[PDB]
Symmetry: none
Subunit: 160 residues, 4 copies
């Protein structure tokens, strides 16, 4: 289990370029780690009815932490996604549904698709403790990235 306080579970996933990425090895870099889980790339964000691809996810680049977006999509796909949105951070592929299970942030069956990453957000301190956590069961529910950026910088400034 993972929730406010508890220590975040280590893990390793491939990024857009198939380079393995270990969580603790990243926390070991000095800055906090922002983990963002999302259903699927090239997927729109909606409201009551209005759906668009206006995803301000690139604003997480403003945060003073190592951002790690994670979805069950493949590296080749995420790589495509990363390049098209000129995203500066890394996108990890949980193609084998490992992590989404480890962090208990998965949709049993979304629109027919089974085992999809839920929209979740975790901020882990350089030691390994979950300083922040946000999750919704509504997939078309885009997060407040500006928000996560604040909390991220807050937590970052915390370690002074």
């Amino acid at each position: 289990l993972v929730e406010l306080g508890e220590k975040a579970p280590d893990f390793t996933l491939p990024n857009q370029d198939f380079e393995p990425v270990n969580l603790y090895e990243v926390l070991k870099r000095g800055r906090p780690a922002v983990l963002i889980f999302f259903p699927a790339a090239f997927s729109p964000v909606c409201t009551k009815e209005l759906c668009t691809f206006r995803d301000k996810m690139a604003q997480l680049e403003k945060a003073n932490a190592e951002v790690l977006a994670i979805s069950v999509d493949s590296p080749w796909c995420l790589k495509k996604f990363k390049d098209e949105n000129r995203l500066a951070f890394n996108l990890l592929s949980d193609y084998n549904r490992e992590v989404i299970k480890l962090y208990n942030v998965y949709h049993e069956d979304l629109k027919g698709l089974k085992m999809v990453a839920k929209r979740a957000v975790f901020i882990v301190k350089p030691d390994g403790t979950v300083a922040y956590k946000w999750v919704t069961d509504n997939p078309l529910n885009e997060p407040d990235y500006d928000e996560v950026v604040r909390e991220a910088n807050k937590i970052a400034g915390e370690l002074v």
Copy 2:
């Protein structure tokens, strides 16, 4: 497991637009069905020492059969792929690994990724019999689409 002559197993998968697509219902349309399985979209094809995204897959549009490309990628991704390559045919998402198992055309573990669609090609006649079949265990091995187009039109015309 499937093999030439044998009758192709029915199935239903979502296309780029989440519309369900039943195999037999397509065969019922009158033309032969060409099924193309591929590891992943936005994936490159490589030669002895070369690698590129020069995938002449759009040539299958020349065939006189309903073409159905299938990969475990998600609909949102395939949709992205389809639009960017101006592909006229449908791409079906076997996100749940059903069909790649049904047709016994899956890689156990590709570059670390588990349960990936192998590069396979099946041509099914309006009745349901496999008139053509080709498969390779080498993923970076692009098929001869000009070829499949021939065999496809041959099988199509053979139905005088």
Copy 3:
């Protein structure tokens, strides 16, 4: 009644080459803008000051970053054939019952003797439902500038950041 620029595009559902129903709003709900292209008939030629040919650069609409929906009163079977022969990536919807061409007020009374034919019209609808672009001519043999439509389409697409 009538659909006009700025105003909101009327919803509707038509069959595509494969008889699959296609609802306008359900498409706008997909995230991208919708480009609607009406044309008299498939396998119909386009002409200039005189030169008539079947050199129709309609496939260039695939370059646009919007869901393209070509519409004509032709039948699904006919459109499917037309679609496959021109390796068109987008969908062709059949207004066999003259519904939509009337809804959008884009129909010829009597073309060459044929009654209730779709006029050559172009509409670009934003994901919300507002007509951001509109172009129509009463001259049937007047092929549209697809290259053009594609840029207005991408503009409207991009101006959505």
Copy 4:
């Protein structure tokens, strides 16, 4: 030497995150490789009277090729540079002056500093051939990134 038509020499450098990055292993990814050498991070670009930190280097993210900016700066330094300019691509550290020597793109003594990367640009095809090359001995001479992006997409499209 490293000029047009000639085949680019392989090499491996660490990126902002100390992850090793092999040139050929990147070319093996499918897209062309754009190598950009620069004197130093947090260094300004000037003219004959005015200087500024208006470096449109992030525009290389528009190119359809794997971009690899290289300088003798350290990984920690590049990482800081990368995050501050929200640069999507990778920055490789040639701390040991290897590559700049290998590609013969180094300043003997710049403003007193010895063995600094010269401002150079190489575009390599997935096979390994230099399709483009541009170099200047004037360090404060910022390149036309918009340009490199063109040549990059041209070369990218050429492999169709």
